[PDB]
Structure formats: C-alpha cells, structure tokens
Design a protein around this nucleic acid. Structure first.
Ligand code: MG
Ligand code: ZN
Ligand code: ZN
Ligand code: ZN
Lengths: 137, 56, 118, 144, 56, 56, 186, 49, 56, 92, 100, 65
RNA sequence: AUCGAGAGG
DNA sequence: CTCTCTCTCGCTGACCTCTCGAT
DNA sequence: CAGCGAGAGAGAG
C-alpha cells in the first residue's frame, strides 16, 4: 500500500466488484468518389485487395460486416471495405482493424444511410474490465 | 466578502481561519482557503515552466 | 486657491500686478474686465493633503448597509448612531485613522487625538 | 405559523423548488431560447432591405418574420420526416431546424423561402424533447 | 531540438508503476509481455549456443 | 484533548485580543512607525506575525 | 445594435507625477495626435473655459482638480472657436472640419449615441472620464481592476451563435445582391 | 442625473419585486459615489438571494 | 528527468502482472509516487552500452 | 412575490448579506466544544441572506463529502478526478 | 558600521541621515505662491513676525513653504540647515529667510 | 444495475433478500435498519450491499426495444 | 497529416 | 557642434505520456 | 518582457 498504493481483496473482486463494461464503437462509411464510383462494403478478396491489413477476415461475414457475439482480439477485422483504384489488385483495403490492445465480444452492428446516402456501419464491441494491479482507484 | 462589513481589517475578514480541519470550516474560511489553494496550484504549474526554462 | 473667471464670458482670469500702487488684480483675456484680488495667493501646492479624508459625505451615507456602525458617539449633538470609515484617500502612505460621521446632525469626528483640523 | 421565520432546513426546500423550475443547465437553454425567439427577428430586421437603383428604378427586398421549423430532416431522395435526437446521433446527422423567412419583393419606380438549416439545442423549446413526457422520452430513447 | 537533440527510440517501453517490497532496490520488475516484446541482440558463442538454441 | 482544546481556543482568543488592541491603537493614530515603513505596513506585519505565532 | 467591433477612447495625463506641463489629452479614433481636452470640448461646442471645467468637474469646492485642469486651459486659450478646433484634426480646409464633425458623431462615444445634436451628453461623459483620471491622479480613488467579475461578461451559446448568424446572413444577402446585379433579366 | 435617489430606488426595487422591472436587470447605487448604474446587460452571472 | 538520478540502470526481473515494479526506496531519486505514475524503460543493444549502464 | 432577488456582482457590491437565517434573528454562554467556532456576524443591517452557503460550490465540489473539513487543493483534485470516475452515464 | 563601533545606535542614525537622500519635497507639507507688495510688510501675520525676528531685511512675489516638524526631527537636518541648503543651491539668484 | 448476489467482503448471498426487503419496508413502514436486521445481514458489509444498491434494471426495462 | 480540445503524472 | 549618453520601439525566445474531435 | 540594438536627439560638455 506504500506511496498511496492500495490492496484490494481478490475474493471481493471475484465477486463482481468495480467491474466495468467497456463499450467501444468503431464507425466507417462508404466513401463516394463521385462519377458513379463508390467504396464497397464486402469481405475483401485477397487478389482483388492490395496492402490488406495483417488480420483475420475469417470472423468477417460475406458482407464485410461482422456479427454480434463474435469474439475479436488483436488484429481481427471488424469492418471490411474495399476501395476501387483507377488491373490486378484493383481494390485497396479500407477494412478497419480492431485496436491491438482490446479483447472484445461484438455487442452490436448498426448499418444505416446518411443524409448524402452513403452507408454507415458502427460496430460496438463489449468487454468486461475487472480490477487489475495498477488500475487507478 | 459580501457578508463582512466594510473596512474590516479584523482577522476573520482578513482570512485567518481559527477552526481546525476536524472542527469544520465556516463558509468564509473555506472560500479564503480556496483562494490560497488556487494560488498554490497556479504557482505550481507556471513556476515549473519558469524553472525548467532556467534548467535548460 | 480660489479660481476666478470674468463674469461675462467665463474664460479664465489671469493675474496682473499694478506697479504704481503695488496691487494684484485678475484680468480676463477675452474681455478687458479686471477685478481686485481678495486673497493674495496666486497658487497653492500641497505636497501632503488631508483633503479627501471625508469624501462625498451625504445624509444618505447613513443609510448604506455596507458601511459599519460604531460604538462611539459624537460630542456635538451626542448622537449614538454613527458610521465609521477608513480614510477615502488611497495613498502609498496612509493613516489608519477612522473617520466617524454622525447619522444625525452631520458631525464628522476624526478618531485621531493629535489633529482636530476640519 | 406562516409568520414564523425559516430555518436552515427550510432553505433546502427553496433550493429544491428552484431546481425543479429551472434545472441544472437552465442557463444554456434560456440563452438559446431567447436567441431563437427574439434574436433571429432582430438579425433579419437589421439590414433587412437591400436595394439597387437606376433611374434612367429601385429593387427592394424586405424580410418578414423568420419561421423555425420543429427540427426535422429530409433524407436525400426521401420525404421530409421528423428528426429525433437519438436517431440523429445514431445517424451521424446534424440535429437541424428549417429557417424560412417571409420575403416581400417590391420594385420601386413570394411564399416562404428557406434561408437555412440551424442546429437546435436539445431541451430547447423548439426541440421536441422539452414538450415530451418521461414515458415519451423512454419511447424516444433519450434518457429521462 | 525535436529530432536531433531528442529522438523517439526503438527498444523503449513504459508502464504504470507500483512498488514491490520483496524486489531488490537495484532490480526492476518488468511485465512478461514487455520482456517478450523487447529484444537484445546477442552474438552466438560456444558458451551461449545451447542456451540460445533452447530460447529460440 | 478537551483541556488542550480549550487552551488552543484561549490562545486564539489572546492573539485576537492583541490584534484588536493594535487595531485600536492604529485607529487612535498613537502609533510608532518603523523608519522607511508605512504605518499600515507595520500594522500588517504585527497582525500577520501574531496570527502565525498563535497557530504555531 | 451597431457594429460589434470596438472603438477605444483613451484620455491620458502627460508628464511624470512630479512635473510641469501636465496635460490631459485624449486620442480620437482616427487622429494621429492626441488632442487636448479643451480642443475636443470646443469642437463639441462647449466653448467657455469655465463651462469646460464645469463639465469636467462637478464640485465647485475642490481646488486641486481645477489647478491640474488649468494648464490644459492654457492650451485651450489658443483655440477659442469650434471651427478651429475641428480644423486642427487629423492629417492630410472645411473638408478637415467636416471630417472632424463626422468623427465626433460616430467614432467618439458611439455607445451613448451616434446621432447629431447629442454632443453635450458626449461632452459630459468625457468630463466624467477626465474626473475619474484626476481622482486616480489625486490618489483619492484607486485604479480600477480588470479582475472584477461584474466587469467580466460570459457569452453563452446563444450570443455566440448570433454573431455567426448575422455574419452568415450578411454574406447570403450579399450573395443574393450579386445575383441581382449580375442579371437584369431574371 | 436625479435627485432624491433613495425614493426612486425604493420604487425601482418594488417594481422588480412586482416584476414590471425585469428580475434579471441589475441596478446599483453607491451613495458616496453619488452614482447609479442600471444594467439590462446580458452575460452577467447573478445569484439568487 | 531533472537528474542523472532520474535515469538509472536496473537489473531485469520478469514479473507476472502488468505494472513495472520498483523498490520503495528507489522512488525518492526518481520522484516516483505509486499512484498512477508512469515510468519508462530503455534496453541497451550493445555489450559496450550494457557495460556503460552497469558500470556507471 | 418579491421574497427572493437576483444579484449581479456589481449589485452584490452595494448589498450586505448573511450566510445563515439564524444570524439575522436577534441574539441577546455555554456551547458544545466540538462545533466549529463561528464569529458572530457583528453586523447590524442585512439587505439579503444567502439561500445556503453550500451553493457556492460547483457540482463536482457538491459531490465531495466534507470539503469544509479538508484542504481545498484536495477538493480541486477530486473535482477533476470524479469526471474520470466510472459510473452509469445514462439509462439509454 | 565603522570598525570598533558597535552599540552606536546614534552613530548608525548619523550614518543613515548622511546616506539617505533627503529632499525639500520629503519635508515640505505645502508650497504656496503668495503676492507680498512690500518686502518689509507681509500679508501673512506669521511672516510679519519672522520679519520682526530679523532686524536686517527683488520681487513682490513670495514663495511660502510649510514643512512638517516630525519629518524634520526624524531627519538630522535643522530648519536653519534646510534653509541654508536652499540658499547655496540658489547662488543668491533667490533670497531665502528661514523661521527658527 | 441489479441486486448483487453476494456481499463482496464475505460472499454471503444477498440476492434472495432484496425483493422481500423492499416489501418489508413498504409493508410495515419499517425502517431500513430493522429490515436489514430481520434479513439477517448483521455485518455492515452485507448491510452495505443492499442499502447502497440502486436497481437500474427497471429504468432499462422501461425502454421498449 | 494538420489544427484544436481534453486528460495523466 | 557633437558625439554621447538618453531614449527609443523592436523579437524573442521561452518534461514526457494518453485519449478524442474535427479538417 | 526586457532588451540590447542600432537609430535618433537634444545636451552638457
Ligand atoms: Mg501517478
Ligand atoms: Zn471675459
Ligand atoms: Zn452629531
Ligand atoms: Zn458481508
């Protein structure tokens, strides 16, 4: 407990104490280049997509949008989008990696259309954070 | 303070806090202590900036 | 030093000395009007001024809540209500001499024992 | 007993009534509400008319009172529909009210044009939520 | 000043710090993830060849 | 302790009485000013010293 | 109600505290050199020197303030008519006087009033400012502080939106005007 | 300027209490100052009392 | 980092949990306070550099 | 009704106020030692009386249990830290 | 203090008086510009008494300086010494008489 | 958000009591302390878990979805 | 990127 | 006279770390 | 926010 440190009862923590649901929402929208050219939300095709992020797309569905209940950590790709390029590797990856530190269970995914008409996706991942040594109290 | 009378150089108006922390502080005493503490925090940060310029 | 102007135009009088009878009289530039000088003081400079020790003393000052009310009492009308204030003049060197003003009879009684000048 | 003075405990009841009448953020809402109710009209009445003239004559455009729609959005390629704050936050779309001025054009010897979309403070008189019941707020998914 | 005098450094780590009574004053308690992340180049020697083989 | 608490309050009161006596003396204008020192300056030092010493 | 941006009027007392030739001089918003208060009062129309001092000073009794005023009256004796006071204005004839008059109506104390024939109220306020300057000079009153909360005004969201709204509305009205000038036909 | 300022101030205070004078508007009189400044101005923080 | 004392060589000990661990005493040269303070560790990459940290 | 009034800082300068209602009530002695020593107001005229002293405090400060019994810098530190503190931000 | 001089409070006072810049402004309560038509007869009764004090005796205009006793006592200078200082600074372009 | 199963310090189950506890204080207009004593939460920790808890699930339940 | 804002020692 | 000591209006600079917004 | 610095500027030699 020295220098303002503290000691917390592991038995009292095992019973849910100071336990925080942490929700993180990641958003990506279809980006319109104009002239009938649009970014596409789909699971990327490796030959079609160049410089894709080094993460698993297996969790990602066909649509390029992950589904609730999937467990994602590290480099797992939560949102999959491809960018047409002005002919091999025509698409370029716009997929959104999960942040490296998070482990998560996908709470929900919201797909809608904005005022201009582009498709919006918001993926909320849910983690439970338990008191761990060094957390500020 | 608006509660104190005009031209009061008496110790309570001038901010001397008779009461201890245990006893409790009257509202005027607390505001005066807050003035002092604010000066302290200001002093802390800005004077660290000055001292670091000196050190460099 | 009371300052005077010619009556007709109110522009400021200028001092003038007549040598033959050795007399001082003030003449306006705008109008040739000249008048004898009642007091023979062209100018006064106070390095130290007690003036402003009592500033804006009104009957209504007695009403103001901020100003404190003293225990002591004025000898003149023997009023008990009186309002006491520190000197209005704000100086590098100031005397912490309380000036007490009567609520009734408008008597101002300085706390200081040394000086009784108005 | 009415004549008896209050005590320190009685003061907290006055504080309570003050907060039920005003609320914590009352100052923000009052400023925005005044700006909508009266400031917009003064802003347009100042420099209201703008005239060019050539006798060889003068064209004047004066402005009637501004009308602020209850906040709603028209989806592009969609009908104009009421916008609500929960939907607005999920949509990444701005909470917005239409600004329409009665405009009168005269020639010196036309409906309500819509001058623009103004953001609306939540809990403003113009915002729906201020009128809404707590149960209505639950349905609207904005927290009571 | 921002680059030549001072640089971002490879092989740098940082953590919230708490103190251990049992740990010796000279030593530093490094988390296992930090230790795994950071690497020191060691030239293979006849002395270290067995140790390094097993580490790899 | 209660007895010690009463002694502390009595010390605060004695310092306050000294402060009011010095204030009355200033009001009477019968006061000794240190050379090169305004009368208000001297009054401020005396009262500050009284209150600090009383706290100590 | 007028344009938000500020005209700041300064009235300053020249010379060290222990000096001769102490003058009270104010800066006009558009004029290179501070003009003596007497010249300003003459251009304002308050011609009599005693009348100028009465505008400045509201108590007959106090001699000291009047004595400080007297050197400025000595600068004022040179110009005894309003036309010359308006003449010695700015840098570059009746055009100069006219520029002075327009400046007096709009530039100096715009907040009291910017219309014509209100010069006396402006002069009274100017004399009040000179009196305040002298009270600080007399040490009867201490200098005002900036930190006082009543002097501090906290702009809320509504006013902040109002300034931009007026700016944007001005730009949009200007744009509508450009369209109208562009096409005679529609 | 005004004379008998205390009567006018009592009237103004009673008007504010009635509410014909805006409750927000702040009127300050200092007697020694011999000045009365009334502020309808916005942006002044006020406290209930 | 006011001092050479603020940058001191330490002997690695690998610990399970996530916080850097340091002795209670060594806090004072570091100005360390165990509430939420964050400290940085750098790893030498050369034998001469390691010898410089260890010897001095 | 005119029972309560709104005071600007400049209007506050002209007024003299009392922290507590009981202090205005005329006072003509034994006391519990533990209660904090309060100077008698010694003031004759009170234009107004404060609704409650605690209202000087901000929201985060109003959360602090006994800021009167603690050093003010600590109250500032907690007023900053409580925004960092986790809680149920909204039901929605 | 000079070596071998301690507990010399008055020597320290003399040293203080010597080092301290003292001006007429420091000791002067007031400066007054009077007009006195006759050098022998002054309008001021006090000045007439002073004129009587010196059997021995230009411009009618007079400058009258009133100086505080307490400051003059705090300073080492006598009043005659102050009037002296004024005199040799003036070069006798101006003529000064001092009250006792 | 919901009644904790057990007091963190001991682990004595407190989730059985809550409903009853509420009813008791409403049924008899009983003070909270007597209700906690009848519940058997004699230790102030088991007491604290019930007294300090606020049941936010009701507010969450109000939302229609 | 850039600019800003917030926060921690 | 003058070159000088006096008086100017300039510019010039003033520990990391972590989010989050906008462009 | 000095400032030390060129650039005036009467000024007391
Ligand atoms: Mg820390
Ligand atoms: Zn005349
Ligand atoms: Zn009397
Ligand atoms: Zn328990």
């Amino acid at each position: 407990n020295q220098e303002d440190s503290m000691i917390m009862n592991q038995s009292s923590i095992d019973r849910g104490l100071f336990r925080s649901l942490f929700f993180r929402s990641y958003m990506d929208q279809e980006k319109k280049y104009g002239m009938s050219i649009t970014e596409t939300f789909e699971k990327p095709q490796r030959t079609n997509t160049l410089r894709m992020k080094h993460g698993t797309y297996d969790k990602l569905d066909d649509d390029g949008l992950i589904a609730p209940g999937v467990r994602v950590s590290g480099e797992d790709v939560i949102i999959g989008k491809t960018t047409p390029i002005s002919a091999y590797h025509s698409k370029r990856d716009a997929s959104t990696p999960l942040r490296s530190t998070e482990n998560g269970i996908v709470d929900q995914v919201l797909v809608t259309t904005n005022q201009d008409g582009l498709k919006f996706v918001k993926v909320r991942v849910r983690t439970t954070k338990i008191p761990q040594i060094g957390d500020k109290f | 303070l608006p509660h104190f009378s005009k031209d009061d150089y008496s110790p309570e108006s001038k901010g001397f806090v008779e009461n201890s922390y245990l006893r409790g502080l009257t509202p005027q005493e607390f505001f005066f202590h807050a003035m002092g503490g604010r000066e302290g925090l200001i002093d802390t940060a800005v004077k660290t900036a000055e001292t670091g310029y000196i050190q460099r | 030093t009371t300052f005077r102007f010619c009556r007709d135009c109110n522009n400021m009088l200028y001092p003038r000395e007549d040598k033959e009878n050795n007399r001082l009289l003030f003449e306006c530039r705008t109008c040739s009007y000249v008048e004898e000088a009642g007091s023979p003081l062209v100018y006064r400079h106070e390095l130290i001024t007690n003036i402003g020790e009592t500033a804006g003393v009104v009957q209504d000052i007695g009403s103001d809540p901020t100003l404190p009310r003293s225990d002591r009492e004025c000898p003149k009308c023997h009023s008990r209500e009186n309002v006491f204030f520190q000197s209005q003049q704000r100086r590098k060197d100031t005397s912490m001499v309380l000036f007490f003003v009567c609520l009734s009879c408008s008597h101002i009684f300085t706390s200081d024992q040394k000086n009784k000048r108005t | 007993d009415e004549s008896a003075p209050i005590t320190a405990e009685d003061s907290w009841a006055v504080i309570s009534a003050f907060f039920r009448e005003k609320g914590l953020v009352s100052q923000q809402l009052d400023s925005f509400n005044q700006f909508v109710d009266y400031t917009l009209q003064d802003i347009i009445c100042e420099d209201s008319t703008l005239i060019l003239e050539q006798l060889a004559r003068k064209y004047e455009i004066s402005f009637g009172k501004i009308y602020v729609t209850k906040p709603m959005v028209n989806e592009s390629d969609g009908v104009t529909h009421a916008l609500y704050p929960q939907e607005a936050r999920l949509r990444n779309l701005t909470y917005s009210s239409g600004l329409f001025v009665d405009v009168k054009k005269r020639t010196y010897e036309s409906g309500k044009v819509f001058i623009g979309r103004l953001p609306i403070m939540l809990r403003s008189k113009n915002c729906y939520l201020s009128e809404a019941t707590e149960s209505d707020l639950y349905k609207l998914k904005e927290c009571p | 000043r921002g680059n030549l005098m001072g640089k971002r450094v490879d092989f740098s780590a940082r953590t919230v710090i708490s103190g251990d009574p049992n740990l010796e004053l000279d030593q530093v308690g490094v988390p296992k993830s930090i230790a795994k992340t950071l690497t020191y180049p060691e030239v293979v020697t006849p002395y270290n060849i067995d140790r390094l083989t097993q580490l790899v | 302790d209660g007895p010690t608490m009463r002694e502390i309050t009595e010390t605060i009161a004695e310092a306050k009485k000294k402060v009011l006596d010095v204030t009355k003396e200033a009001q009477a204008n019968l006061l000794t000013a240190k050379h090169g020192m305004t009368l208000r300056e001297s009054f401020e030092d005396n009262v500050v010293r009284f209150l600090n010493e009383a706290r100590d | 109600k007028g344009s938000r941006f500020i005209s700041t009027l300064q009235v300053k007392l020249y010379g060290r505290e222990g000096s001769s030739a102490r003058t009270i001089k104010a800066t006009l918003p558009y004029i290179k050199q501070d003009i003596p208060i007497v010249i300003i009062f003459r251009a304002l129309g308050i011609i009599p020197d005693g009348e100028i001092l009465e505008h400045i000073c509201y108590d007959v009794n106090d001699w000291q303030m009047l004595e400080m005023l007297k050197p400025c009256v000595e600068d004022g004796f040179v110009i005894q008519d309003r036309e010359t006071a308006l003449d010695f204005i700015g840098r570059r004839k009746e055009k100069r006087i006219q520029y002075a008059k327009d400046i007096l109506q709009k530039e100096f104390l715009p907040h009291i009033t910017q219309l014509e024939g209100f010069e006396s109220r402006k002069a009274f306020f100017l004399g009040y400012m000179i009196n305040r300057l002298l009270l600080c000079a007399l040490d009867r009153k201490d200098q005002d502080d900036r930190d006082h909360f009543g002097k501090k005004r906290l702009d809320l969201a509504g006013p902040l939106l109002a300034q931009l709204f007026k700016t944007l509305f001005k730009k949009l009205t200007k744009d509508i005007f450009r369209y109208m000038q562009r096409t005679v036909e529609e | 300027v005004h004379r008998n300022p205390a009567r006018l101030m009592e009237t103004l205070r009673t008007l504010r209490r009635k509410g014909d004078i805006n409750p927000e508007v702040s009127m300050i009189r200092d007697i020694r100052e011999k000045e009365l400044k009334i502020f309808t101005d916005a942006g002044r923080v006020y406290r209930p009392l | 980092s006011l001092h050479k004392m603020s940058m001191m060589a330490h002997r690695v000990k690998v610990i399970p949990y996530s916080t850097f661990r340091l002795n209670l005493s060594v806090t004072s040269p570091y100005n360390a306070d165990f509430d939420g303070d964050e400290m940085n560790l750098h790893v030498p990459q050369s034998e001469e550099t390691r010898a410089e940290l260890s010897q001095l | 009704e005119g029972l309560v009034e709104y005071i600007d800082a400049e209007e506050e300068e002209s007024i003299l106020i009392a922290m507590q209602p009981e202090d205005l009530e005329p006072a003509e002695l034994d006391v519990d030692p533990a209660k904090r020593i309060r100077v008698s107001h010694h003031a004759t005229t009170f234009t107004h009386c404060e609704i409650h002293p605690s209202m000087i405090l901000g929201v985060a400060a109003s959360i602090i249990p006994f800021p009167d019994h603690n050093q003010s810098p600590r109250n500032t530190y907690q007023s900053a830290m409580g925004k960092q503190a986790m809680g149920v931000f909204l039901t929605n | 203090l000079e070596p071998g001089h301690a507990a010399d409070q008055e020597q320290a006072k003399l040293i203080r008086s010597a080092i301290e810049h003292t001006t007429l402004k420091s000791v002067t309560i007031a400066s007054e510009i009077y007009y006195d038509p006759d050098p022998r007869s002054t309008v001021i009764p006090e000045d007439e008494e002073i004129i009587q004090l010196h059997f021995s005796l230009q411009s009618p205009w007079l400058l009258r300086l009133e100086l505080d006793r307490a400051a003059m006592n705090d300073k080492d200078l006598t009043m005659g010494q102050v009037g002296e200082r004024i005199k040799q600074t003036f070069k006798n372009d101006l003529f000064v008489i001092w009250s006792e | 958000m919901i009644v904790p199963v057990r007091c963190f310090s001991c682990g004595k189950v407190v989730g059985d009591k809550w409903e009853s506890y509420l009813n008791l204080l409403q049924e008899d207009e009983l003070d909270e302390g007597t209700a906690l004593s009848r519940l058997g939460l004699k230790r102030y920790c088991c007491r604290r878990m019930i007294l300090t808890h606020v049941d936010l699930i009701e507010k969450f339940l109000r939302y229609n979805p």
